[PDB]
Amino acid sequence: TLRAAVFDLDGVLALPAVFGVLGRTEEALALPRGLLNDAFQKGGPEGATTRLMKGEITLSQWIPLMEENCRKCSETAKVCLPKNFSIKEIFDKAISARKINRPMLQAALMLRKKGFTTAILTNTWLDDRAERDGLAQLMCELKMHFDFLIESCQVGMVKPEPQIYKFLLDTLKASPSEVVFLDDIGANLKPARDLGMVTILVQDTDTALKELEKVTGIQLLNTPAPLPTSCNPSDMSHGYVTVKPRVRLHFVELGSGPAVCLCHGFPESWYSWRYQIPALAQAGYRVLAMDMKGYGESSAPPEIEEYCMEVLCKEMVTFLDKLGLSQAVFIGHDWGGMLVWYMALFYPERVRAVASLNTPFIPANPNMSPLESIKANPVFDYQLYFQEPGVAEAELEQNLSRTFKSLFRASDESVLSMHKVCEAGGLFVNSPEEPSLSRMVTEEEIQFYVQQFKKSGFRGPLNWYRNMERNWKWACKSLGRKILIPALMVTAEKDFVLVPQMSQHMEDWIPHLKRGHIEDCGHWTQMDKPTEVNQILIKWLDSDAR
């Protein structure tokens, strides 16, 4: 029966409420009880406050009207306001105090996940204060989670006027009985109740959620911790930079603040960062999530040498030149991990900070061919298998769904050992035709990768593994250097190829290296443990890259 949920902003989705600041100020200052609320509400439907909420005047225009009101209310109560009494001050402080009420947001999210239409209906104002950015940020963060945001000051109507509820119903394309409406002000609930909408008077959050759960029959309280926000590909800004005549690089871009370039591994996609992109933008960064050369909407030339580290890095430098970025933070995973270490070694002036997930920095051994080094470790055998052009391409392209479904698996779900792959004759020779879905990925998500890999297949991606000698020779030029810029190494306990112990000597080359470690996390770090990745990157960014 219920198909829609509507939330207020002040006192419901955001706390503490700004009305509450009138009460507290009166109390803090020993003013007559309700003096500030009287001034705020003075003139009722014709007063300054309503014209503000209807969008007739702006917040900065309203400020000295409320001031006048405060003076008038205090003369008639026969009291004085303190020296320095400041409405601007009181509201600045109240508006920055007010934060997203996380359990209300997460209930709204859950309800939208079971198919509810969700809306924010709020009485609010045109905010032109020097400090307005703080509220623009809150509204941005909230509104991406809802179907509609309806603001008194944009539509020229205010709760409790009945026309705004009709406007609400009309926006929702729902009858009143399909709707639950939550509000902290009972007078604002009444007209909803008059049309026969379910209403909830929100005082403390848990009681409101308990009522909300009973009436929708969905569990909202005590629910397990949800995944971070993911990205919908078609809601992203897509960017394209030609770094040389046959090579354009695609990236997805979100956020403002210091530039942070995310570099995925094999055989992946910008979309492998789908969990870190909103979180890092939300944390104050400008995220650029690449399709690395060979992938997705980036160019994929056929030639092996187009994918040696040297060329790849020079191209990332050019990519920063064309965007006008003198630096970026470089964060990589797997092959992208190896690439960001090389960026730090050969272009430290361009790298604000470098971080790698799973991929350690191991200096080239000048006394041993890279092929032999790879032959010394049974678990890198899959790399020898990748050498012969065409062999791995045919297996990996043969059935794309089965490919990503077989590869993208948590540590306790694996269907393919990386063990004697050449000898067995391939990666999947002993894996099912139709693997089950990993807990880490939905069917929709696999199909995004499948569709990405239909453009260029696996030639470009596999080429990354076909410059062992060339990369070794280039790496050997850097053997006297150290990495002395800010650097984070994140190891993954259950990555059985890029094992944590392979990073154990990194302090010899990177003396001030910082670390994170993620337990029960396989090779596909970002999607396996997205919450922990986010927490470790954002903490390191704020302390070291900012």
Next chain:
Amino acid sequence: TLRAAVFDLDGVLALPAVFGVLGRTEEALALPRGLLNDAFQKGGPEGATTRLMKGEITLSQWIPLMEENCRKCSETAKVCLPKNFSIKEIFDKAISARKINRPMLQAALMLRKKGFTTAILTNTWLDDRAERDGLAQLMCELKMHFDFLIESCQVGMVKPEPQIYKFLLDTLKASPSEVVFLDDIGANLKPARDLGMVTILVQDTDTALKELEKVTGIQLLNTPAPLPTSCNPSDMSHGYVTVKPRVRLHFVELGSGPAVCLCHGFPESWYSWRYQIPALAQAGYRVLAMDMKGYGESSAPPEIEEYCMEVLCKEMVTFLDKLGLSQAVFIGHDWGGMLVWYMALFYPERVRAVASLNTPFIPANPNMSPLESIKANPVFDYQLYFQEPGVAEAELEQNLSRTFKSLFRASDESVLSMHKVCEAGGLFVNSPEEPSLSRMVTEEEIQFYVQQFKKSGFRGPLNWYRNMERNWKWACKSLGRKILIPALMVTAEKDFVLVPQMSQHMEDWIPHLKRGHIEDCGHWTQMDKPTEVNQILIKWLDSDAR
């Protein structure tokens, strides 16, 4: 005969030279003459300095080696270094002191403009200091102006070694006698002179340029002031954001720092900002130069109401939501000008600062139909002509080259009065078939517009003029407000449609409005007076938006 010019960075393209800082420090500190230069050069081809310049070690690794050298040189000279003597300190200060030598850059630019291949050949280092960003910025700014940048530390060779000159020749694809090489160090010139390259020992810049002029036969000194840097479309990062199902917006994006959204007029393009884009990025901003709805690579739906201000503005808000920008500075020209004023009035929380070129803010007259208001001013008659769907489309699409060539003209070059356009039967009825090229635009530039307008023609663009009533009604909701965020109005003396006097009452609505004014500047402000536009926007940005 000469086909190439090669410049050094230190002492030639950038001043003062960092070597010079050794000399000055010795002098400032009363050290033995040449003590710091001895320490810097200690060990010659095997010393710390060469390994730095060859890329073997990084700058931060070199610092305590130079320190050791300074200690050793001072014991053998039988003196002590001052308490607090700091090599890091001396080099930090020297490297930030060093600036682009503007007349050398402008000579290099001029030479490249007459078809020279230009290169920077420099002995330099891998810079991993906390402060390295300053040098990354210098190198970015310089290198976009040259064909090649060759850095000792990237190629593993140093001046004066002869192999780097062979590497130079090979990169240039030129014989030695087709090359002039400028350097401030005579020893570095010698091997160039040995191959028979023309060399110039650069002491003061003007003498070096005088020699450079004599030997190339091109005028380099006393040359008129050049245009700001323009943009090559295919060197830009191109961005695309879907703001709703049939509407994606394209923009070009350069720079980092506060976001600055540029909004062009009718019938224009992101490329109308080609002169402001590098300059504003260079000044510390993140430029987003739009194709407004109806133009270029942005979508162009047919329906009139898709182009009313309300819809257009809401879409710009969504564009910021999808990019994750809580605000941007909005700068507009002509129709884009009108749009940014409406953004400031209806979404001040999203607008960091607002500026308009030519377009004044005039509040809607609630007592007069907008059509009548337009009929009251002979010079807006072209707007009535634009009303009837299809009429203006047919004239403007009939011959695109002639269209932009007729429209894009400086004030003393005009070929069409905006005078009684309806009565005459069109905009061009009394203009030539093949107009001459305006001084403001090259044939190549006109052809960029022609090609942009081949995708959707003039329906979407003209639609901007077809919501007089709808825009008026929406504007009337804002008549009690004031614009109280930071705001700049730039008037253009010889715009005979958007005349400076039409802005004269703006302080009534925008009490703290700032102003610029550009003399001898027609309607096409950005390309007519690009240098003055840049100076007025960047000054206002730095003082009001930052």
